[PDB]
Every structure is written in structure tokens, then in C-alpha cells.
């Protein structure tokens with residue numbers, strides 16, 4: 188029997204938490220786990236721009252015939268503009284090629300498969316901490332994962348000196364992974380000056396930069412959030428960007444992402460992209476149309492784009508209001524620890540500083556669900572659940 | 585430069601054909617390449633049942649939050665009933681688990697990664713000829729692919745004696761891949777008696793059967809086309825089914841498929857399935873909702889399901905009428921080679937028996953596009969293009 192001696196896999200630290208939450212029969216349960224956006228009423232809504240684009244598609248789509256391996260061309264063009272900005276030299280020099288992928292995760296795996304099967308790359312460097320699924324994606328393609336220092340847990344800040352010292356061990360030809368903005372799980376991003384230091388260091392050391400860009404627009408703004416990436420794009424001959432539209436379009440389950448390859452010149456990137464397409468063909472063949480068609484419809488229509496940008500701004504500002512409310516409410520409810528570092532962190536997530544034992548108590552005794560690392564989803568907080576959430580946190584301190 | 589030593593990959597023998605066809609500016613060009621269904625007017629339509637389901641989803645969807653790793657529960661249940669039959673003991677005994685995947689290709693890749701990482705499987709046996717992407721998918725997980733004999737190119741039939749003999753060296757614990765119906769590319773399927781003989785041999789030799797089911801309903805009907813799989817399922821402890829809804833729902837670009845694991849008992853299949861979910865999480869994370877939501881809506885609603893089944897019948901019957909018209913028109917246009925074997929083949933495709941040289945002449949000289957193996961898509965034939973198509977074939981014979 189071929190399956191008889193298979194060992195059971197452990198649950199995913201994020202998606203397995205979601206299974207527990209669903210089964211929990213207590214009415215007061217609060218979900219601060221998976222990184223989705225909740226509105227002020229505690230639902231996970233479909234954006235109006237998205238509903239409008241879907242209505243257009245329903246009434247005008249005449250075929251579902253296969254897309255090309257790399258997806259909808261306009262989707263690729265609009266993605267490169269978002270990442271690199273209109274009039275970028277990378278675009279005018281035809282140094283970049285984009286494949287539409289099933290989510291940001293699919294873009295990460297396509298990049299990993301492409302690298303493992305066509306280059307001499309063996310190692311990927313990931314921040315400590317990072318998104319837990321980074322290691323699994325890269326290991327599954329056959330690549331070793333190494334960790335570089337990032338978070339100073341005593342000061343709740345970016346330990347830039349520790350980051351640079353640990354990365355000096357990364358060799359030429361190694362891949363180093365950066366979060367473009369809204370670092371998952373810490374919410375601590377480099378400043379523009381720090382980005383520029385890392386870019387120049389990356390050139391001098393011969394690293395291959397890989398950017399995971401899942402939160403463009405949730406820190407400061409669409410253009411501002413790409414400053415770090417663009418400082419790298421100005422200096423490097425080669426880079427890879429794995430981007431996601433799951434969160435900034437609320438299109439999580441339609442699986443909309445992109446893998447963008449950059450090389451020294453047009454001939455080289457086309458040669459490389461041909462092997463990226465072969466790796467896609469042997470994975471899922473070609474990408475799902477519905478979600479990407481929605482994104483392409485919104486980004487190419489000035490009226491729909493204006494609505495979407497306002498909806499994204501509203502999401503970003505609601506999270507910022509909850510960060511403030513969370514800190515103020517913790518003080519009212521009797522916390523004596525200072526939680527003001529929460530205000531300095533960007534995006535959906537903050538490292539709360541709670542221990543695994545406290546996170547477990549919160550779930551079992553109070554029905555508050557966070558990830559075991561102490562990562563909390565601030566976008567899961569609402570004016571209505573803030574008081575019970577904070578009473579529960581104070582009770583486990 | 586990391587990308588400098590990269591060797592270019594050739595174009596896909598099937599999907600690259602569409603790129604050439606698109607670039608051909610000559611009027612009257614005819615596309616008999618990729619395996620999509622064309623209607624009598626040469627279009628690739630969206631089914632009415634699909635449009636109705638998409639309207640229901642637009643009106644009633646309130647969130648796009650992530651699906652579970654394995655997708656929509658109802659989709660998995662309806663898939664199992666389609667494959668194994670309502671009231672199957674496999675279902676009643678809870679011996680089967682199904683993951684929603686991005687197309688049939690995604691189901692094959694998920695199975696490949698699962699096998700490579702969690703079992704002692706080292707070798708997959710596929711028919712000669714087969715779909716060209718089979719070897720690429722299993723090789724992407726590091727599995728050796730061997731070929732078994734299948735097609736009698738002299739008699740245009742299944743060479744069952746050579747099939748049996750050429751599988752003599754397939755060992756216990758090897759995977760043997762079978763097309764469930766409508767063999768791609770030959771259109772030649774085993775008879776029920778041949779399936780039963782293969783089922784008995786597979787058990788005695790200890791093979792792990794893997795069925796690729798991309799065309800259920802295109803040979804004789806939904807239940808009839810599953811007879812071979814059900815003969816295998818009655819006798820085996822373990823098997824894998826990779827199925828696609830791309831073609832029988834006309835949902836190609838929404839990437840709707842399923843990977844079904846079957847084990848000896850519920851405890852075993854649940855343990856194995858946890859590792860399949862881990863392999864999905866490290867690839868594309870979770871599957872695209874839109875296409876699978878359409879299928880689940882249609883299969884779970886008596887009225888929509890009845891519309892869809894009639895639409896599938898209409899597709900199947902138009903292809904059968906084009907098979908007959910193709911043979912008759914070849915005779916009318918002066919072919920001396922007997923093409924009557926075309927009538928005995930099932931599904932969208934027939935091996936025409938044309939050489940690579942003749943297929944090239946058809947493209948370059950006449951604007952008629954087939955796959956270089958001589959596979960022609962009969963579903964691309966219409967009353968309007970049949971006569972020029974046949975005149976071109978006669979010209980290269």
C-alpha cells in the first residue's frame with residue numbers, strides 16, 4: 188500500500204487557525220488571524236469597483252477560451268506600471284516581462300521553480316521573522332532557506348545593524364527576499380534611506396533581489412509604497428517581483444497575482460521568460476481569468492480606477508484608526524505596558540509581544556484568535572469588538 | 585549575471601500553435617490545433633448554464649475571502665458523485681478526498697508533488713502517444729516517466745497486445761496513467777472488457793493507477809464514460825483521479841479541476857490528504873473560486889444541471905456529425921486514402937496519420953493549423969470550412 192505509511196502533516200499556522208475559528212461555537216469569538224480586511228461591521232466585503240467590473244464581464248464576455256501561458260497582456264502592462272511607475276526606463280527598455288499567476292503565492296512558487304530548474308541558485312535569504320509560508324514555498328522547489336536578522340523585539344524596531352551584519356554571509360548568486368512594504372508579520376519597513384543603502388549593498392555583493400509585494404497601497408500610498416522597489420530597480424541588472432492583488436483589491440479567493448522578471452536587456456529577459464513559461468505550463472498550464480480580468484478592467488478605466496483608489500484609501504485609513512483606538516483602549520482597560528509601538532507599524536499586522544502561552548489562553552478562554560507568534564490582524568478590529576478584545580488581552584498580561 | 589547561462593525553451597507544441605495562428609495574416613486560415621470546442625459558426629461560446637450561474641453568483645456573493653486549501657466542499661462532493669456514481673461504496677465508506685485545483689493540469693501537478701515528497705513512487709508510465717504535457721508535469725516533480733505502447737498506427741486501433749507486453753516491467757508501486765475516455769490524441773479508448781482486463785492486471789501487479797479525466801461526457805455520456813474508472817475503483821485499495829471541467833463546461837480559462845485521492849479506509853485517506861493540502865499551500869495556496877463556484881451551482885441545481893447536460897449532448901453530437909462529414913468530404917474531394925477509421929474515434933481529436941512534413945505544408949501553404957503529431961481537432965471543423973480544409977489535405981497526400 189503506497190499511502191499506508193504517510194505521516195500526517197501539521198496544520199498551517201495561519202489557515203489552520205481559520206479552521207479552528209469556524210468550528211468554535213461561542214458567539215463572542217473574534218478573528219485576528221488570517222490577513223483579510225474586515226470593514227467596520229465585521230464583514231469581509233466585495234469592493235464596489237469589483238462588483239461593477241464583474242457586472243461588465245458578465246454582460247460582455249463571449250468566450251472562456253484559454254488565456255496564454257502568461258495571462259492577459261493588459262494585466263501585465265498595468266502591473267509593470269504600478270510597480271515601476273509610468274515612463275520607467277525598465278519598461279521603455281523592454282527589460283521586464285510579467286506572467287499573471289494564481290495569487291502572490293503562485294508567483295513565488297513560479298519564481299522558485301524557474302530559479303531551481305534553470306540557474307545555479309541554491310539559497311534564498313528570508314527575514315527573521317517572515318510569512319511562515321515563505322520557507323515552505325522555497326523548500327518545495329528544492330531551495331535552501333537562510334534567515335537574516337530584522338526585528339529588535341526589545342525596542343520593537345528594525346535592527347538595521349544586525350540586518351547588514353547577518354546578510355554579509357550571503358554570497359554572489361544568492362537570492363535575498365525583501366517585503367516591498369507592510370512587512371508580514373512585524374509591520375516595520377525600512378526607510379527610503381535604508382532601502383537605498385540595501386540596494387547599493389545588493390549591487391556590490393551580487394545578490395539577486397526578490398520582492399514579495401502583497402500590500403502595495405496599505406502603508407502610505409500606491410506610489411510611495413513602491414519607493415523601495417524602485418530604488419532597487421534603478422541599480423540592478425536583474426530582479427524578480429512576486430506581487431499580489433488579493434488584499435488591495437479584496438480578491439483573495441480569485442487568485443490574482445503576477446511574477447515579474449527583469450534582466451539586463453530585452454534579449455536576455457525574453458530568453459529567461461521562455462523558461463518561466465515552461466515552468467508555468469508544467470504547473471497549472473495557464474492562469475485563471477476572472478480575477479485578473481476584474482483588475483485589468485478597473486485599472487484601464489479611469490472612472491473605475493478612481494473608485495478603487497478611494498476604496499483602498501478608506502481601507503488603509505480604517506486600519507490606522509484601529510491602531511490608535513487599540514492603543515488608547517488598552518490603557519483604559521488597565522494595561523500598564525506601553526503599546527505605543529503599535530502606532531509606528533504599517534499595514535494589517537503588528538507583533539503584539541504576547542507569548543505563545545498568552546495567545547493560547549486568549550483563544551481557549553476568551554475566543555480571541557491570533558497567530559501563535561503573537562501576530563494580530565488590526566484590520567480584524569472594529570469599534571464593536573475593541574472593548575472585549577482589550578479586556579481579554581489585559582486579563583492575560 | 586544570474587540569467588546569462590539560461591537556455592531558451594522551445595514553444596509549447598500545442599499552446600504555441602495559437603501564437604502562430606494569431607500572427608498569420610492570410611485570409612481563410614483554419615485552426616484545428618488546441619483542444620477547445622467550436623460551435624457551427626467557428627466561435628468558442630460560453631454555455632447558457634454557465635451564464636445563468638454567473639448571474640446568480642454576481643447577485644448573491646457577499647465576500648471573496650479565501651477558500652480553504654481544498655476548495656469548495658460541495659464541489660468536491662459533486663465531483664465524487666460524477667466520477668464514482670451516486671451511492672458508490674467508495675463514498676459511503678469515506679475512502680475518497682477531493683481537492684479543488686486550478687484545472688486538470690493543476691490536479692496532475694498536485695498529485696505529482698504529493699507523490700514525490702510523501703511516497704516511494706519514482707516512476708510514472710504514460711501511453712505513447714499521450715498529451716505532451718504529461719511528461720513535463722511529472723518531470724517537474726523529479727519523477728521518471730516511461731512510455732507504454734498504445735496505438736496501432738496500421739489498423740488505427742488499440743494495440744492491446746503491445747500495451748500488455750510493454751507494461752510487463754512496470755513494478756509494484758509504480759504509477760500507471762490512464763486516460764478515462766477520449767484518449768488524447770488518438771481518440772481510441774479501451775472497451776469495457778479491456779478496462780476490466782487492465783483492472784485485474786493492475787491489482788495483480790500492484791500498480792498505483794492515476795486517471796486523467798479531461799473529457800467526461802464527450803465519448804458516449806457522463807455515466808458511460810466513467811465505466812472504466814469504476815471497474816478500477818471496484819477492485820483497488822488506492823487510486824488517484826485528476827479531472828478537468830475545462831472542456832465539458834467550456835470553462836477553460838477559469839481553471840476548474842479536481843484531484844481525488846482514494847485509500848483503503850477513511851483514516852488512511854485523511855492522513856494522506858493532509859500532505860496533499862500541504863503541497864497545495866506551498867504551490868498556489870488555495871484555488872480560484874469563480875469557475876468552481878459555477879460548476880458547483882450547476883451540479884447542485886436540478887434545472888441548471890438539466891440545461892448543462894443537454895448542452896453537453898449538443899456538443900458531443902456536433903463533433904460526431906463533423907467526423908462523418910469530414911470522411912465524406914475527403915472522398916468527394918478525391919482522397920484515395922481510406923479515412924473511415926475517423927468515425928470509430930471518440931472525442932475532439934483524431935490522429936490523422938499525416939506526417940510532420942505534411943502538417944508543415946498544410947500550415948505554410950494552406951493556412952491550416954494542426955499539431956505536428958498529426959492530431960486534428962474535429963471540433964474546429966464547420967460546414968463552412970470543411971470543403972477548403974479537405975481540399976488542402978488532399979493536396980498534401
Ligand SMILES: *Cc1c(COP(=O)(O)O)cnc(C)c1O
Pocket residue numbers: 222289290291292293318366371399401431432433439442443444868869
Ligand atoms: C498574502 C501574502 C502572500 C500571498 O498572497 P496570495 O495572493 O494570497 O497568494 C504572500 N506574501 C505575503 C507577505 C503575504 O502577506
Ligand SMILES: *Cc1c(COP(=O)(O)O)cnc(C)c1O
Pocket residue numbers: 471472619686687688689690715763768796798828829830836839840841
Ligand atoms: C485538457 C487536458 C488536460 C488539462 O486540462 P486543463 O483543465 O486545461 O488544465 C489534461 N489532460 C488531458 C488529456 C487533456 O485533454
